[PDB]
């Protein structure tokens, strides 16, 4: 079925591979070559998860956990049950994520819109590969990657973080958090502002964008504008994820001590480093 205004857009063309062979829809979903590839990787990866569940001995989704190979395996291959499934499932997940992004690109072309969406999705893919590929490789073992389990992968975050004391002190970690908090802050303000203008007080006619500008100038003396807030929201969310991958790719590769120690260069500058008093004196 279609939306009332959808038919005029369902024209042929825009594909990157296969011409018109996969240029069609299944219900609302557009297929395309990379829709087929996505389905292929996704189906295969899910079969390997089910197969790992059988080896594990449970069909409870809360317990299923596919672990990477032990550290002793280094960066070589491992038997399916002893880390190989994680390796293959990681290959399929990458194929699915990348196929998904290229499918979005084909949809941008058919609709004549910009490519901002798949470009933003690629930052999320980057963060995934930072944890399962880049950081393990640089450290020299797939075992440093995280396990595929609802709860076991939270334990990995806790074990990895506390290996370096309080991970809070990772300075790139602080920056990434600031963008996550600021992003949610900006998202709430933006959603609230449009709704407040489209849904004014009772007995009032719909507001204009000038009211949105005026409201924020009255509130904090500046309005970024209708275009600027969408630029901002894109930048806040991508910067948050960028510094996330940054704060981890440096952990265990060029930094190995507790992250609080990193802040010593400031405290122990030879001039004020010895002045008695204060917290550090």
């Amino acid at each position: 079925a279609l939306l009332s205004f959808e038919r005029k857009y369902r024209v042929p063309g825009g594909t990157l591979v296969g011409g018109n062979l996969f240029d069609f829809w299944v219900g609302p979903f557009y297929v395309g070559f990379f829709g087929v590839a996505t389905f292929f990787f996704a189906a295969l990866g899910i079969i390997l998860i089910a197969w790992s569940a059988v080896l594990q001995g449970t069909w409870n989704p809360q317990l299923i956990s596919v672990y990477p190979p032990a550290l002793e395996y280094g960066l070589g291959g491992a038997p399916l049950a002893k880390g190989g499934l994680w390796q293959i499932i990681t290959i399929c997940a990458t194929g699915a994520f990348v196929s998904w992004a290229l499918r979005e690109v084909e949809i941008c072309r058919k609709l004549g819109i910009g490519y901002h969406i798949p470009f933003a999705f690629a930052f999320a893919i980057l963060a995934y590969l930072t944890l399962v590929l880049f950081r393990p490789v640089m450290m020299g073992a797939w075992g440093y990657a995280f396990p595929y389990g609802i709860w076991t992968h939270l334990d990995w975050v806790s074990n990895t973080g506390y290996t370096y004391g309080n991970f809070h002190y990772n300075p790139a970690h602080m920056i990434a958090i600031t963008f996550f908090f600021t992003n949610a802050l900006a998202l709430a303000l933006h959603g609230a502002l449009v709704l407040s203008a489209a849904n004014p007080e009772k007995g009032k006619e719909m507001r204009t964008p000038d009211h949105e500008d005026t409201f924020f100038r009255d509130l904090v003396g500046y309005s970024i504008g209708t275009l600027g807030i969408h630029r901002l929201g894109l930048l806040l969310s991508l910067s948050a994820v960028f510094f996330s991958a940054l704060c981890m790719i440096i952990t265990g590769t060029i930094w190995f001590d507790q992250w609080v120690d990193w802040w010593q260069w400031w405290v122990k500058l030879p001039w004020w480093a010895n002045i008695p008093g204060g917290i550090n004196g």
Binding site: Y115, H116, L187, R217
Partner: protein
């Protein structure tokens, strides 16, 4: 191809003094200078700003809070400017000790000053909340901003006021300090058996992540259809254009369903407020109802 991340050609005209409606124009400043810097990313105009009783009260009360923490840091620094800059992030204004309970009779150097600072912060935040309400009201707008703000206040109220009272001790509140409040966050989880296994904490994370997910989708979507004037969302709501249609169809073809130009902003406001809404619940239940979240989790 031009991507519309930075303005190519800035244009500038007479300053926009803004809509009037029922705003008391006596409390509006003049217009500030234009910022070519900001003009590359958004609007270049600074000001005017509205400055009423609440704003004055909020700003003053807020600076008192800032100054109170300040003189304490200078005092911890022995009034030495060098030590002040060295140990700036290590200074901390802690709440009263547990023995004082919920009493305000703690001497200034043993939590009395933390109580004074919290009072100023309390007045500054709440008077600012009333500000977000009256500014919308003066322009005949909905109060979505004020209600969304309550969600953030909810968590802040739980961390420093509501939960400590229910626990019966101001010592359960958060200290004022850069590093000190990070450490407080760390000890809080360890004491309560790993917050990872607090379900409201996991829910809060899903919405924090989901907020970055949704705003990246929405920001990218509006820029991709800005070639059709898609960022003029209020008129797209009143008169759907090809921008709104292409935006909806991209996501329908991608994941099977879609939003409207208005409806996406209800997804956005709820995705964001749910972060601090669920978070405040998770913290409020920690120590009051559940001492160990990991253990509590194993029984459910």
């Amino acid at each position: 191809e031009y991507q519309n991340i930075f303005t190519q050609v800035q244009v500038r005209g007479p300053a926009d003094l803004g809509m009037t409606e029922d705003v008391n124009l006596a409390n509006r400043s003049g217009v500030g200078p234009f910022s070519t810097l900001l003009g590359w990313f958004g609007n270049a105009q600074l000001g005017p700003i509205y400055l009423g009783s609440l704003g004055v009260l909020s700003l003053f009360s807020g600076l008192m809070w800032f100054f109170t923490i300040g003189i304490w840091f200078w005092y911890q620094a022995g009034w030495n400017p060098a030590v002040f800059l060295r140990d700036l992030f290590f200074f901390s204004l802690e709440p009263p000790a547990p023995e004082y309970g919920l009493s305000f009779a703690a001497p200034l150097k043993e939590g009395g000053l933390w109580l004074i600072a919290s009072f100023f912060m309390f007045v500054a935040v709440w008077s600012w909340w009333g500000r977000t309400y009256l500014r919308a009201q003066a322009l005949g707008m909905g109060k979505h901003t004020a209600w969304a703000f309550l969600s953030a206040i909810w968590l802040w109220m739980v961390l420093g006021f509501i939960r400590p009272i229910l626990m019966g001790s101001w010592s359960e509140a958060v200290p004022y300090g850069i590093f000190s409040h990070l450490d407080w966050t760390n000890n809080f989880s360890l004491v309560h058996g790993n917050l990872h296994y607090n379900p409201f904490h996991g829910l809060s994370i899903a919405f924090l992540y989901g907020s970055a997910l949704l705003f990246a989708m929405h920001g990218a979507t509006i820029l991709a259809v800005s070639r059709f004037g898609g960022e003029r969302e209020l008129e797209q709501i009143a008169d759907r254009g090809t921008a709104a249609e292409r935006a909806a169809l991209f996501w329908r073809w991608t994941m099977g369903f879609n939003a409207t130009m208005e409806g996406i902003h209800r997804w956005a406001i709820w995705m964001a407020v749910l972060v601090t809404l669920t978070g405040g619940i998770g913290i409020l239940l920690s120590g009051t109802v559940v001492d160990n979240w990991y253990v509590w989790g194993q029984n459910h």
